[PDB]
Design a protein around this nucleic acid. Structure first.
Lengths: 77, 71, 76, 73, 73, 77, 76, 72
DNA sequence: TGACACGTGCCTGGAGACTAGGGAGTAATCCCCTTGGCGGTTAAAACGCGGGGGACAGCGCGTACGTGCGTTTAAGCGGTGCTAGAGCTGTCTACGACCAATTGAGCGGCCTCGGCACCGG
DNA sequence: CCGGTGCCGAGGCCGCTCAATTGGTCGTAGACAGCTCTAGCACCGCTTAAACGCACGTACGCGCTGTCCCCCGCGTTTTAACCGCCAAGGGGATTACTCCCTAGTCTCCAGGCACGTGTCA
């Protein structure tokens, strides 16, 4: 399944697209593939930040844990 | 906009990621992170659309953008 | 600027290559590139494990920090 | 000693210092050695493959550069 | 049609028959095409690397053999 | 012989290579080896997914069967 | 940690080694490494048979599940 | 004198729990033991092969690591 | 010759097997609609002759170009004994920050229709 | 030279889960100390970077030759896509069942250690 709601994600994607380029429409299948990819990326990042929190002798993940996970992974953070 | 990815949705994503307890501030932080990710992928996606002179983003454009943002 | 000693690392490279193919001779430039890249990779891994140690309110890196850094980077 | 011991404790300490590490547990060194072997093995495996593709008996710098690129460093 | 569509439905059916498959879901064909594309991409990516190492412009059979060997094949 | 038609597979391989290096030109022997290897790999995958299908008391194979076969054999699934 | 008892594994590996060559002793470190390896292999095979059972509309793993997992992996 | 029976049922259950298994048929344990024996034989066979090549009489940790590599 | 592995003994908590209880996941069956398998067909991409053109792979050779070695040394570097101190780690505490639950409701998703944007046979 | 597919916007319904507010509670950052371990000082060995000869395997570049890759026509060709009928079955529901999950107790033992003994490069 898809954990993120379809219509809000569509709206956000259209917002960022209109920021980049105007009158650049997306297919439903392209939006579905992009949403699947983003959900996979988010669940992977949450797995990594859960590993970070477990490493810090804790059970509740924090924003600094996600920051550390993204800094170690190699993203722009 | 970015606020449409609601708190219970982010909680569900974290649950699927194996997270048992979640700080309240993560959600705002995660949203920022998500936006950056989306921008980057879409930027590449739009580049492919513009480079091919098709003006229509295809499913393949997105797949290639994602690959080149994870290779 | 090569922190690892040249002759021990050369001997280690020769030993590891004995398994893959026997009687293989390495160019000096090849061993230099191997040493430079291994040093850069170890420096990056140590930066990441130091970040992990600082995350846990510590200053002493521990093997669990190295395993965490390798698991996050996709190596474990 | 075995060649893995040639990456000496002070060498690993120097690498950690350059990596910004201020304090190092005694068990790190052996662990680091293990990690290095895996990395080297992978790179060298590719390097030797390249050497074999060129029908050469001398591993060149170019074999290593291609191995390193394709192993992500 | 896109070149991925050149791996036709009857070809995938024949491959499944050789694999001992008696009945085949309609979604198998698309799934197989995706899997095949991934496999091909990986093999060819390695193959082209080998080709570049030899400073050639023609991918040879040996490039492919090394790519296949270095993969699970 | 080769179950997959020669020219479609050749065009697909040439497209993937033109993605990777563009200027590449394939030998006939290289394309034949690629085709033989891909056919053998797909035959093995279909045999393993047929085992997975018979495991669930279904004569028909399903995409979930192929996903399971790729997940167990070590491939990314 | 380790989930298999150490002394029964010692006696088992001793009986298994007795067949090939008589009284070729093992360092305790080698026995511990072999036990860790068997631990990893068994937990991986049980994960695979759990995937098989979840794929077969079941929750209980069965001998046919682990046999199918081993045959798909390529062991036997 | 079966030594394979020293790997008890609760140990195999614990291994399955670590593998994420929630429910376990009773016959798996005997099956698992057979599987385990085969694995060990193969690994030890390679280990002993390496040992014999090295003409040593003491199997070392490196012998086992090489056996495992050449098996896995 | 000196460090490492094997056989005995006690014992105490730590763990393994048994059977009492049961219930819940597993095993056999039916049919409903789905959906592959197969019969016809034709043409549209496949696939070998055939001239033909040639960019480039494969091989042979010269040459110097970089590898490996005998031998030194020395001196910067490593193994190590001992120490003072700085941090790891186990523990107490308390309170801001987490999890569940119900209630109005506000936006998702399905249903449908008017409108055009557009690369294309 | 116009056309079928799809996107955008709007009317309008159900629907279902979203936010807030409450309660409950918990678990984590700070303080505190026992421990331990380690960075460094100082000594003495050591073994590595470099420098001489010294010989030498061979990497690489250049040239020659063939040689198969690309090109198209093109005739045949044959089988892929599509459509329609036949019927095999996926599976959701149903009913029985049987055997595996707890688990307390009786009983076996893991290893800690303490010791004595034999062994191998």
């Amino acid at each position: 399944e898809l954990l993120i709601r379809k219509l809000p994600f569509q709206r956000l994607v259209r917002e960022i697209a209109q920021d980049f380029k105007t009158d650049l429409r997306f297919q439903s299948s392209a939006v579905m593939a992009l949403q699947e990819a983003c959900e996979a990326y988010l669940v992977g990042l949450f797995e990594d930040t859960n590993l970070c929190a477990i490493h810090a002798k804790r059970v509740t993940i924090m924003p600094k844990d996600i920051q550390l996970a993204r800094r170690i992974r190699g993203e722009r953070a | 906009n970015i606020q449409g990815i609601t708190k219970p949705a982010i909680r569900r994503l974290a649950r699927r990621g194996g997270v048992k307890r979640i700080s309240g501030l993560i959600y705002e932080e995660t949203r920022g992170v998500l936006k950056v990710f989306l921008e980057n992928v879409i930027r590449d996606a739009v580049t492919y659309t513009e480079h091919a002179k098709r003006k229509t983003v295809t499913a393949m454009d997105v797949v290639y953008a994602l690959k080149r943002q994870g290779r």
